[PDB]
A paper describes a structure:
[name] is a subunit of the cytochrome bc1 complex, an inner [name] membrane protein that is part of the electron transport chain. Activity of this complex is integral to oxidative phosphorylation and generation of ATP. One such shared molecular target is the [name] cytochrome bc1 complex that is important for the survival of apicomplexan parasites such as Plasmodia and T. gondii. [name] is the target for quinolone-based compounds, but, significant problems with solubility, and toxicity have been noted with earlier [name] inhibitors.
In binding assays and in co-crystallography, JAG21 has lower binding affinity to bovine cytochrome bc in comparison with previous compounds that we have tested. JAG21 “inhibits” Cytbc1 but not fully, indicating that it will be less toxic for mammalian (bovine/human) cyt bc1 than the apicomplexan enzymes. The electron density map in the Qi site of bovine cytochrome bc1complex with JAG21 (Data Collection Statistics) reveals an additional electron density, which allowed unambiguous positioning of the inhibitor. No additional electron density was found within the Qo site. The second aromatic ring in the tail group of the compound is less defined due to high flexibility introduced by the oxygen linker. The quinolone head of JAG21 is held between Asp228 and His201 and adapted the same conformation as 4(1H)-pyridone (GSK932121) and tetrahydro-4(1H)-quinolone (MJM170) by directing the NH group to His201 and the carbonyl group to Asp228. The carbonyl of the quinolone head and OG1 atom of Ser35 are within 3.0 Å distance that allows hydrogen bonding and enhances the binding affinity to the bovine enzyme. The 3-diarylether tail extends along a hydrophobic channel defined by Gly38, Ile39, and Ile42. The trifluoromethoxy group at the phenoxy ring points toward Met190 and Met194. The binding pose shown in yellow, which has the strongest density, agrees with the crystal structure and has the trifluoromethoxy group pointing toward Met194.
Numbering used by the authors:
A (entry chain C), B (entry chain C): 2 to 55
C (entry chain I): 33 to 78
D (entry chain C): 326 to 379
E (entry chain B): 22 to 229, 235 to 439
F (entry chain A): 2 to 221, 229 to 446
G (entry chain F): 11 to 109
H (entry chain E): 1 to 49
Amino acid sequence: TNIRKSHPLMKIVNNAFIDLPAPSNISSWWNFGSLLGICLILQILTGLFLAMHY
Amino acid sequence: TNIRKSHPLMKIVNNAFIDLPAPSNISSWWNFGSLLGICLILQILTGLFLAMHY
Amino acid sequence: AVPATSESPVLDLKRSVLCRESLRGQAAGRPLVASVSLNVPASVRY
Amino acid sequence: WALVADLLTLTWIGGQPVEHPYITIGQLASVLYFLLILVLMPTAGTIENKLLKW
Amino acid sequence: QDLEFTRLPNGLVIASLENYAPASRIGLFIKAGSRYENSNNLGTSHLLRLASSLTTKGASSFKITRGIEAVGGKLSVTSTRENMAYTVECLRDDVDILMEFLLNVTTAPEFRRWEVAALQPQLRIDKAVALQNPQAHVIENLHAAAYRNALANSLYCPDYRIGKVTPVELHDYVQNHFTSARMALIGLGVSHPVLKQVAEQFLNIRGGAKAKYHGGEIREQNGDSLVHAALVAESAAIGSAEANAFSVLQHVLGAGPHVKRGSNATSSLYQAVAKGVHQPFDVSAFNASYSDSGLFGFYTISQAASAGDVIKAAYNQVKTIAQGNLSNPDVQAAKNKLKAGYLMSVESSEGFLDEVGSQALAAGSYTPPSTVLQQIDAVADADVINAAKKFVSGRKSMAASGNLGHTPFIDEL
Amino acid sequence: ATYAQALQSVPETQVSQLDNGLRVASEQSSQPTCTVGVWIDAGSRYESEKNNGAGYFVEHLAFKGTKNRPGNALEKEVESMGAHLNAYSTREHTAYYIKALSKDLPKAVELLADIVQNCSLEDSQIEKERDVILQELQENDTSMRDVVFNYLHATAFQGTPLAQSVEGPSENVRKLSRADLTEYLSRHYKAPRMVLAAAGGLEHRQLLDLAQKHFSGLSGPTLSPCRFTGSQICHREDGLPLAHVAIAVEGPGWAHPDNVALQVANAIIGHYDCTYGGGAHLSSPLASIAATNKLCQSFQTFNICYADTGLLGAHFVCDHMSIDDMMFVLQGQWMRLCTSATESEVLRGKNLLRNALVSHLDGTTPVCEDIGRSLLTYGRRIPLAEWESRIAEVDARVVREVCSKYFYDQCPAVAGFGPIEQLPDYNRIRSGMFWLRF
Amino acid sequence: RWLEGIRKWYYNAAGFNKLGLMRDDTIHENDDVKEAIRRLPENLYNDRVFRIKRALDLSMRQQILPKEQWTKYEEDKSYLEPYLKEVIRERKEREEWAK
Amino acid sequence: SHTDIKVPDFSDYRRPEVLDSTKSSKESSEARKGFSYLVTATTTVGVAY
Ligand code: HEM
Ligand code: HEM
Ligand SMILES: CCCCCCCCCCCCO[C@@H]1O[C@H](CO)[C@@H](O[C@H]2O[C@H](CO)[C@@H](O)[C@H](O)[C@H]2O)[C@H](O)[C@H]1O
Ligand SMILES: CC1=NC2=C(CCCC2)C(=O)C1c1ccc(Oc2ccc(OC(F)(F)F)cc2)cc1
Ligand SMILES: CC1=NC2=C(CCCC2)C(=O)C1c1ccc(Oc2ccc(OC(F)(F)F)cc2)cc1
């Protein structure tokens, strides 16, 4: 057994990110979730850096 | 079976909050964790309300 | 040191026989022997 | 409890001006802080063990 | 190079051929087979067979595995109804390392409560595997049917005892059976004097009923499309001259195949059965021979519907051999098979060690291959007919497994 | 009397060749019994698509009579002298051999000669042995081990004669006429592609003269290399209770010296099943982990050798929930040996291999077969003293370097059969063939 | 020998005896101790289980036993030693073998 | 029989280097990995920048 399935933090990452069973056939329209996440993180960083000056 | 152990959100609450097995004999010194949580939430609320005016 | 003539699993469906030519050899002719080991897979004999 | 009392001393000394006798007390308290954690309390553990035939 | 032999005043046999091969096999043979269980400690010898490599006094459970594997070696434990055989192999330079382990395993096992209990499920694994062979079902039942007590014991632990073989029982079994008076230490590629000295210093350990034939039948109803079945009568004790006659009769009737995918033109039984029924089948003469007793008969494997026809056809063939229908060319062919079979069985240094040790327990000393062949020749045509006659008129024991709807009972035959 | 010494005084193997080109090979010792046989460079690799399984079909017909001994006469004569007659067929090697009394060696050699050369191949006997093979093919479908290995080859050596099964497709079995069989025979069964091997109580000189007497009539097709492909074949069948997985990289093939070092490495990882005495304390980390966590029911490392190529890897049988974990630990072992094998564990592997091949060659049959096949594959019998020299040459550095050649960052062939839902995706398997550190 | 005066003093000062505990109940459970506990016979294990249950219950109430009920220094058997000693002795052998 | 299964033709999909079934893939293995890993390595250098 591996320390991706064992470690309490890695376990959540391994199941929701790496070994997640995904349908074979999902299209480009399924990318938008990931992109929403990137947007949110992008806003938070840029935003925080702006808030250092505003 | 109950909807405390079933529901994905309640499941986390039921296991980490309600049916959590705790030692019978823990003293007053074990209260400080909960109190740290209250402190943190207290700071966040009061803080946010102050930030509306600062 | 050397692995046995057959790898043994429990809960595994067994190999079929459908002819005379594969079924001969099987009729027991002498009493049972039982070996267990460190290196070699357990197997019983006629 | 010595380590606690020492920390209470360091808090008092921290609040004081840099002069006699607060410099020397401060030095002596800071020595005792690291001495308690790195030497005395480990030694005390092993002494306790050998008192219990351990 | 030829074999050397010693029997010490304490009862123990040492036999060893120094042949200067690169590999060295050493075997400690003990009169401690399943037969020496009683109804209270059934399956103890089965656990004991699984139990080498548990912690000993001079070596840990860990050290036995690692130390033996370190030198590329092997440690095996082999049980019949009458004997247990502890065998070690390695490259010649590491014999006394393996010997140290073998002595520890056999003379001072600790059988620790937690280790012994941890081993319990292994009885189910080992049994489950073995009972995948339907021959194992039938032969184990056959004995249980044929005997009242010693040889009736199965080599595999009965279900009810799995999880319940105690440390005490394991200690008792070793203490009562693993003794100088019951032990033969056999070897290849090692000097006789050094074996003797080990046996004197480390195997001098102080000492610690007859098999009643019954005649019964046991029937496993299980709905296979094939029916395995065995029918035997009481034979003759190994060591007696009569036993040799049965061995010849076995090979007259047919005792397993000689040609790959062959139709067995010289096998008397196979042709007798193949005359009546042409669908998939196998038939062989069965011959077990023990210190107290023996079983001789035949084993059928037939289609469920044809089981009656096959068994009766096979039984009829023995009857005509018993009635006197048997020529010299048959008895000569049968002898040639048995003579060849014996020399071929001692061809490997594995099987040779097994025969040296096997003889050393059931009899006084080593009989050379040339003397054995002469004793096969000593069987007259008349002795073969008597063995067959004995089988026909003998009280029968039977066992079957399969869909037995058309398998007859003993009293239907 | 030491081990090093012992090897020097093992009986040498004798080597002679006939006019036609048949090699006669012999190992002698004062033994009452013997084994003698004919090995042939013939098998499924030499078969085309249209005649696949012919060598197997022939094997069925070999013992079913001759011109000199029609029908069961051949059979009867073997049986009545206590002899034991046997045959096998690999992808590259067909072999017929007889275990007999030493005194009966003349007749033994005679009968082998009669089988090979004067094989009846009767019309009714063909039609009989046709249905027999069809039922063996059905039996073979129930052996998951056989099925998965056939699949491994089929995908590993895809689009070549090595992808072909020994038995041939059912289509061929049902259609192969006697014309096909006899044409196959005269093309492949030739003296220079054949070896007469014997072991037991015999004078080499006598065998050679018996070869003259009966094998003189023997007459006197190059193998293309085989393209290995990184590929997967996944026969998903959830109805079966255990999963069979077979995985391998391209091996070097018979000739190559690296095979010795690879055997040492394969010995380190070793093999296991549920009836093994060792358990947790087993020396192989794969075995001890597999035993303690009940990952698999069984596994073995293999290294299968063919002419210019082979299959180097492992097979395992496990619970439907353990396939991913088995793969992870197995591939983890490959990587650990590649990158970081230790001296002491290589010494263990060496010792296993030394012991393996010294005790396998026990009694006349395995020794006869070693003679037969070694002459085909290597062109000689390699003595035990030479094997030992090759083994002593292997240290930790060697195991690393050799394993890294074949295992590290290389595309494997994967075959899976049964409840294989967990069996890792090929990309994940392929990524499991390297570490992000070394 | 001469420090036996201090050992007896420390014992009562430490005061686990006041909860009806023996010394080996107070051992912090590492991997070795876990295995040692796991190897205890039914009797010795169930005693351990109860003694702790009793101590925890007393701790819960912030009370001690009557002085008669306190574990006497002399009567404190070292019940876990034979199991623990061997567990450790075993692991050190595997650790050796690994090098 | 399971011997009836033979792997479909993947010629359409193969790299030129591994098309020839009578030649060993091992010559081209050094190369084929090089190409694909160069793409990955180039990408990483770009992302780094
Ligand atoms: C969903 C996440 C967010 C969205 C959709 C968002 C949206 C916006 C928008 C539309 C503006 C006006 C931009 C303009 O016209 O200049 C803005 C301004 C701003 N945001 Fe955010 N924002 C997000 C998160 C954050 C966070 C986390 C912070 C700070 C920690 C932040 C700090 C600011 C600041 C300081 C400004 C004023 C500077 C500016 O105008 O660019 N924002 N935001
Ligand atoms: C661990 C949590 C927090 C701690 C320990 C903390 C601590 C402090 C302290 C010591 C001060 C100076 C108080 C004074 O002397 O007046 C302060 C001021 C302030 N904090 Fe926080 N704070 C926390 C969280 C927050 C959050 C979440 C916010 C806003 C969302 C916030 C907003 C402010 C503001 C606006 C002030 C200036 C007003 C004031 O001086 O009271 N704080 N904080
Ligand atoms: C005659 C009986 C004496 C017993 C009673 C003691 C108190 C009487 C005063 C005597 C002097 C005490 O000593 C006092 O120590 C501190 C701390 O080291 C000094 O402080 C000085 O020394 C330290 C030495 O590390 C320096 O880092 C620091 O920069 C410097 O300010 C005071 O300048 C000094 O006055
Ligand atoms: C967690 C995810 N689940 C699934 C799919 C499609 C297929 C199946 C389900 C995804 O693409 C997927 C995912 C989601 C987000 C990814 O990047 C992140 C972006 C932001 C992020 O932070 C947070 F928490 F979302 F705010 C965490 C991750 C990467 C992958
Ligand atoms: C989650 C908890 N676990 C345990 C103990 C003692 C006994 C056993 C373990 C607790 O007292 C405990 C707990 C912790 C916090 C509690 O109140 C909160 C306070 C803050 C809070 O928010 C957050 F996430 F902590 F920031 C969430 C909960 C209430 C109970």
